[PDB]
From a paper:
Variant [name] was produced to test whether residue Y364 is required for homodimerization, as proposed previously. Proline was chosen because other well-studied ene-reductases, such as morphinone reductase, contain a proline at the corresponding position to Y364. Like the other variants, the monomeric form of [name] is almost identical to the wild-type structure (RMSDCα = 0.21 Å) and misses nearly the entire loop L6 due to disorder. The sulfate binding site is identical to that in the wild-type homodimer, except for the absence of Y364. At the highest tested concentration (20 mg/ml), all samples, except for R283D, which was not completely soluble at this concentration, exhibited a hydrodynamic diameter of around 10 nm, agreeing well with the calculated values of 9.18–9.54 nm for the respective dimer. Interestingly, variant [name], which, because of the lack of Y364, was not expected to dimerize readily, showed a clear tendency for dimerization with increasing concentration. All enzymes (wild type and three variants) could be crystallized in their monomeric and dimeric forms, even variant [name], which lacks the putative phosphorylation target Y364.
Jasmonates are phytohormones that are pivotal in mediating plant responses to various biotic and abiotic stresses and regulating plant growth. The first crystal structure of [name] from tomato (SlOPR3) showed that the enzyme crystallized as a self-inhibitory dimer in which the L6 loop, a critical loop involved in substrate recognition and coenzyme binding, from each protomer intrudes into the active site cavity of the other protomer. Based on these observations, it was postulated that the formation of the self-inhibitory homodimer represents a mechanism for regulating [name] activity and, thereby, jasmonic acid biosynthesis.
Residue numbers in the entry: 10 to 283, 297 to 384
Write the structure that this text describes.
Amino acid sequence: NPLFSPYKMGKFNLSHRVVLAPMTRCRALNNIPQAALGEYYEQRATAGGFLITEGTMISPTSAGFPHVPGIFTKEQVREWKKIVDVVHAKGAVIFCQLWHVGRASHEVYQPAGAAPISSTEKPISNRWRILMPDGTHGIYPKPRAIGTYEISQVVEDYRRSALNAIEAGFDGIEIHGAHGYLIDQFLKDGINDRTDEYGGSLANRCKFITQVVQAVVSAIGADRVGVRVSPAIDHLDAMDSNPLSLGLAVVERLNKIQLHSGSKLAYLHVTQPRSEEEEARLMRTLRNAYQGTFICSGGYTRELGIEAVAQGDADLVSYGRLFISNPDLVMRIKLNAPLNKPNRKTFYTQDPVVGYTDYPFL
Ligand SMILES: Cc1cc2nc3c(=O)[nH]c(=O)nc-3n(C[C@H](O)[C@H](O)[C@H](O)COP(=O)(O)O)c2cc1C
Ligand SMILES: [Cl-]
């Protein structure tokens, strides 16, 4: 089984290729990592296995979901440390995903009920609704477009959050540059209508992700930095006129960062949408262009993951929904055992046990 051959992810020696995908679960009450998160990540931890956390706030303005953890206060760092410690005691490697939602927020999630920030003043359309703290759905508002000084401030929030992650003991961080959140609001020409040096051309639209990645690389080192993008996922009105072109432009900037650093990033992580053959060729084209480790994600099964590694299409395969419902997903894939079905009703609810740690083991 090629999913169970070992893999060197830079200085991290993985024993198998099954990765916990980052997943917002909303159990981090009032943005504090809770003991429940330790139980949940401990259940899914394996010796030599890689875990990526749910998206994690980099600043008081970065959230657009309730009860998502932060890593920008020293209190948050203190609580994360306890979670990292129980994961490392099972021999897993764990990265913290650093997440800013940009325009995908609401007054209820912002300090002083201020407007969310973005590359432009265009809001998400009424085809999308935001989950509110009371479990109903709300309207996305008009964001505020930020200038070049404030862009540098947001880059510094990424930098400080990455340093905080290392202080908590994380092995590395992942930059969340996908799914129509802040970075993707600069990448996608369906959102970025700027006329300054962050808008227009592919080089200009790539400037923000390049500045973010360079900042976290200088702070903690390239081999502790993973990058996640999704050029072909249209979520939250995040379309590009040429997804393959945009994706290859991002890869170009990552290859160039690696060569200036004399080091490789931890990985490039790309989620696909589910023309099945065109999307497959889009993924293989990004992988072939990127000089390093490639994680694929989005709709993978046991059989689709074995085939991705066997055919050279990916080095690592991350799983989301099957890892919600199967704490021992790795062992179930190894044994080719039945899989529990996930209950979508409790994906984002607040109970520390129900729908979170009570899916059974084999
Ligand atoms: C409940 C839920 C929350 C998610 N939260 C995040 C997130 O916080 N960050 C992110 O980059 N992707 C997030 N994702 C996407 C997953 O990381 C992953 O790409 C997707 O689940 C993989 O597809 P699969 O579920 O078919 O395995 C989330 C997915 C789900 C179902
Ligand atoms: Cl997401």
